């Protein structure tokens, strides 16, 4: 009995590899996110379930994330291209402290600074004063205030017809390539998965920019589930997803005006107007006992991978960078720096809550220092409601003696926001050419 | 008001099945090497002329075409072009396994077989190329005596 | 300083003729699918050339998966289902053009494709290896 060779088509062979992906707006159902260079898609991608397949995923090691980060950065730069640069601002300022109709916790904040600035004709000049913050100018030698970033990268202005709200995004599969999907509920970020189905497009994904808390995220199935690779390596981070959301009120407590100043030919800058009314400070407000129930669920889920007679302690974070000092986000085209150093005073054996917030204007982007974009102050009263879906936790090293472990917030690498969503999907290559042995023989 | 109905085999419908039975969905599996989005792409096919992004899409399309050409051309080198399967004249080397066929054809799947035989590759390619050369043209030249 | 000496058929000249007679000019179209070349402008040139390549490879792949590859017109073993039309064999071949027939059957395409793929796979290739052994 001699045996022979045969060669086949159609064998599904999987090679874990990398490719450029395929943008998809949800039928382009409609600005920064005007997303004209993207594709209208089916709101009902077809879903095919499988059998018998086990498959390993590897969270933190997926090239979807890096492509996502580059694409969102380049689209962010694309939106801010055609608008008017702000080069002649780097003259000095004649300032004075605002001493009119003060409130308690807004001392030293607002300043009144007047200066020379050119008109649209070269041969002239003018006098302009505008109301400015304290987090934006520096002393020189009234006192004399120059600006924060004139001895570094330049400053432009976003156009006022350009919204900041995120839009749900789908990714889909380029030809020749496939996407697999797991359906376990308690599936940790690595390890196998025996329940396999496949699609051609992702679900709706919102590019949400947050700094300390998962906002507008995805709720889990059952409870708190905890995601990290190596909890003994305390240099890593710990990704935590909730079950149930937390409603959170934060609002701009003030009434606001805005000027419109001419710079040059076709060059108009928007400065801050003059405030109608008195002065307040921005605040944030949450439930009381629901937070306690939430951290009770936290304690209930921490007990598996480490000790339960080990006592749980919360603390303020280590401090430092304003990227990770306050919790920041993008409600209503404005950026909020909220003093979260009161919510994390806790230690447990395993109505209204109010915190102040801060506002800036000169906004460096993701981690880059070679870019600076200025927002126009929006008039009126801003109110923003959202949810809270998860936390990013850091633990110190050297925590010996089997109890009283300390947890702190942090994690200023915003790819983990994407890792907190894309933990289900995997891109793989098809190689349809296969061989096999058999007993038959061909003929001449 | 959209209701669904009757069924077919479908894309990747037999990846966890017995190879002797899963050997018959090769058509639907092999159709989508050049598609998968078989839908108004033409407008963005048109107006993306002054950017790098349509250039990268052009990169992707040309690369996919070349991969299909590499596969079909390498099959075309052998005398098995234009077919789904073919038998040949290389005797199997029983050094590579000695399992009976009743386990492979009944209780073994494709990815298992992939993880088994993944080092014997280029030897098999060379032997198939040899039998598609030796006496496939030489004795065929000797079979060209009319 | 030229003259004109027409010999062969026109490009799509037979389109207004009847199907069974216009079946004999099928060469000229496939003769004229991939020619015409025989800053922004070269960009859209390459765009057009890539589109032509893609459609030609798509249709040759659809030829190749069927057992009617390489050659021109052929046969099969799928018996006709009369749920699509019910003519009596003269009204089509002698009394109907191609655009008429295309507007008559442009809802049943994918089923016919799939069933030809089915009969091309099944009882043709596993059956071949059944016949390749006593």
């Amino acid at each position: 009995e001699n045996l022979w060779v045969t060669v086949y088509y159609g064998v599904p062979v999987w090679k874990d590899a990398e490719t450029t992906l395929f943008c998809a707006s949800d039928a382009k159902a409609y600005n920064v996110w005007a997303t004209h260079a993207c594709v209208p898609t089916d709101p009902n991608p077809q879903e095919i379930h499988l059998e018998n397949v086990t498959e390993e995923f590897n969270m933190w090691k997926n090239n979807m994330v890096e492509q996502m980060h580059t694409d969102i950065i380049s689209l962010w730069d694309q939106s801010l291209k055609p608008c008017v640069k702000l080069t002649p601002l780097c003259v000095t300022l004649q300032c004075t402290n605002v001493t009119n109709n003060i409130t308690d916790d807004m001392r030293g904040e607002l300043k009144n600074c007047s200066f020379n600035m050119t008109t649209e004709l070269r041969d002239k000049k003018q006098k302009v004063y505008s109301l400015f913050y304290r987090l934006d100018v520096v002393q020189i030698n009234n006192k004399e205030y120059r600006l924060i970033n004139c001895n570094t990268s330049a400053i432009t202005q976003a156009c006022p017809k350009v919204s900041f709200e995120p839009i749900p995004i789908h990714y889909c599969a380029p030809a020749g390539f496939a996407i697999l999907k797991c359906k376990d509920k308690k599936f940790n970020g690595t390890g196998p998965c025996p329940s396999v189905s496949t699609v051609q497009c992702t679900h709706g994904i919102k590019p949400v920019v947050s700094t300390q808390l998962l906002l507008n995220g995805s709720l889990a199935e059952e409870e708190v589930m905890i995601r990290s690779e190596n909890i003994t390596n305390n240099a890593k981070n710990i990704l935590v997803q909730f079950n149930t959301p937390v409603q959170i009120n934060c609002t701009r407590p003030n009434n606001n005006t805005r000027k419109s100043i001419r710079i040059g030919p076709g060059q108009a800058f928007y400065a801050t107007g003059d405030i109608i009314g008195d002065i307040r400070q921005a605040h944030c407000t949450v439930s009381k006992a629901t937070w306690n129930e939430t951290l009770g669920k936290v304690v209930k889920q921490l007990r598996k991978h480490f000790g339960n007679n080990t006592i749980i302690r919360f603390a303020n974070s280590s401090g430092g960078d304003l990227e990770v000092t306050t919790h920041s986000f993008n409600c209503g085209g404005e950026f909020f720096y909220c003093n979260t150093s009161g919510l994390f005073n806790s230690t447990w054996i395993s109505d209204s809550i109010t915190l102040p917030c801060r506002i800036k204007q000169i906004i460096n982007m993701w981690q880059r220092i070679g870019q600076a974009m200025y927002a126009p102050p929006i008039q009126g009263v801003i109110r923003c409601v959202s949810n809270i879906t998860g936390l990013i936790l850091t633990r110190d090293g050297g925590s010996t003696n089997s109890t009283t472990e300390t947890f702190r917030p942090g994690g200023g690498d915003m790819r983990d926001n994407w890792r907190s969503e894309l933990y289900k999907y995997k891109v793989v290559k098809i190689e349809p050419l296969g061989v096999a042995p058999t007993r038959a023989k061909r003929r001449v | 008001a959209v209701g669904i109905g009757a069924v077919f085999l479908g894309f990747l419908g037999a990846a966890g099945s017995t190879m002797g039975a899963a050997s018959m969905t090769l058509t639907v599996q092999a159709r989508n090497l050049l598609s998968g989005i078989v839908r108004a792409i033409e407008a963005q096919q048109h107006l993306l002329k002054l950017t790098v992004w349509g250039i990268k899409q052009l990169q992707a399309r040309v690369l996919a075409v070349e991969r299909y050409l590499r596969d079909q051309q390498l099959l075309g080198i052998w005398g098995c072009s234009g077919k789904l399967i073919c038998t040949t004249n290389v005797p199997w080397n029983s050094s590579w396994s000695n399992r009976n066929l009743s386990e492979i054809w009944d209780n073994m799947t494709w990815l298992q077989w992939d993880k088994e035989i993944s080092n014997y590759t280029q030897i098999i390619y060379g032997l198939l190329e040899e039998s598609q050369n030796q006496q496939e043209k030489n004795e065929q030249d000797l079979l060209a005596l009319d | 300083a030229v003259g004109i000496g027409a010999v062969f058929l026109g490009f799509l000249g037979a389109a207004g003729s009847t199907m069974g007679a216009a079946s004999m000019t099928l060469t000229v179209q496939a003769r004229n699918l991939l020619s015409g070349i025989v800053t922004v402008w070269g960009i859209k040139q390459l765009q057009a050339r890539v589109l032509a390549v893609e459609r030609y490879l798509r249709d040759q792949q659809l030829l190749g998966i069927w057992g009617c590859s390489g050659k021109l017109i052929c046969t099969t073993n799928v018996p006709w289902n009369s749920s699509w039309s019910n003519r009596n064999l003269s009204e089509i071949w002698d009394n109907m053009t191609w655009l008429q027939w295309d507007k008559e059957i442009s809802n049943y395409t994918q089923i016919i494709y799939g069933l030809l793929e089915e009969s091309q796979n099944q009882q043709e290739k596993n059956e071949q290896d059944l016949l390749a052994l006593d």
Epitope: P43, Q46, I48 | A1, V2, G5, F8, G10 | -
Partner: antibody
Framework: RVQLVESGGGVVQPGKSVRLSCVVS????????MYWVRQAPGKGLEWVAA????????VYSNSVQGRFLVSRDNVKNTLYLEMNSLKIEDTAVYRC????????????????????????????WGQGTTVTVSS | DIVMTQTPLSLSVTPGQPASISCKSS???????????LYWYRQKPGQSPQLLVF???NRFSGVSDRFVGSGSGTDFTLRISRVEAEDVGFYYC?????????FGGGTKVDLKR
């Protein structure tokens, strides 16, 4: 033109069975699916059930599920509606109806195999029929 | 399921007096093709139901040109014009986006008695 017929109404008791009828004049029935609606005497209105173009797609509601049956011959131009395991609160008016336009042949999706059907809502009614359930 | 709402039910006006009836819901009833599912129906007591329109601002054969509605996306509406004798009765809103099919509230117009 096109004119509807709704027979089989009155008063019954629980624990029974019915067969209904709807024959509508001069209409093809090879291309047209059709519906059922329901008029409670307290002005309750609710969709009931739908048939395909050729009896190949059966979708019911929640309360009627696993109890009723729809069947149809298009040759005899005759519709059959049969009900079992009768509740007392089934007291209402039953009315036969038609689709707005005709759908065509079924659509296929090649990347799935899921042979799709397409529907759209109704246009016209008839006279209806009234079956009430009491003790 | 996919549900909806109407305006308040009763209405009693005089002839030559336009008004507005809306119909909101919980979802965009846009389908894939761009056709957006919305039916307006009416009847009276002692009267079978009747077809008024079949789409957003698209009316049916036999209906007068007095009755053309509006409203797209998730807010759907209707505008009464030229109040006449036969303008009384029940006014219905209907979905056909997905199973099951839903029936609205049934606003009503009559005269003063």
């Amino acid at each position: 033109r096109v004119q509807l017929v709704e027979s089989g109404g009155g008063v019954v008791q629980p624990g029974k069975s019915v067969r209904l009828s709807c024959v509508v004049s001069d209409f093809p029935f090879s291309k047209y699916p059709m519906y059922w609606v329901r008029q409670a005497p307290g002005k309750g209105l609710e969709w009931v059930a739908a048939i395909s173009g050729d009896a190949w797609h059966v979708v019911y509601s929640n309360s009627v599920q696993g109890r009723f049956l729809v069947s149809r011959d298009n040759v005899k131009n005759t519709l059959y509606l049969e009900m079992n395991s009768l509740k007392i609160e089934d007291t209402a008016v039953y009315r036969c109806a038609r689709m707005f336009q005709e759908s065509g042949p079924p659509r296929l999706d090649r990347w799935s195999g899921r042979n799709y059907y397409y529907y759209s809502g109704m246009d016209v009614w008839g006279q209806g029929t009234t079956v009430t359930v009491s003790s | 399921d996919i549900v909806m709402t109407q305006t308040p039910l009763s209405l009693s006006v005089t002839p030559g007096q336009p008004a507005s009836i809306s119909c909101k819901s919980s979802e965009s009833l846009r389908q894939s093709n761009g056709k957006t599912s919305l039916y307006w129906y009416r009847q009276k007591p002692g009267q079978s139901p009747q077809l008024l329109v079949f789409e957003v601002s698209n009316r049916f054969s036999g209906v007068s040109d007095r009755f053309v509605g509006s409203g797209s996306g998730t807010d759907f509406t209707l505008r009464i014009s030229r109040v006449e004798a036969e303008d009384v009765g029940f006014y219905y809103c209907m979905q056909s986006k997905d199973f099951p099919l839903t029936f609205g509230g049934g606003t009503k117009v009559d005269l003063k008695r």
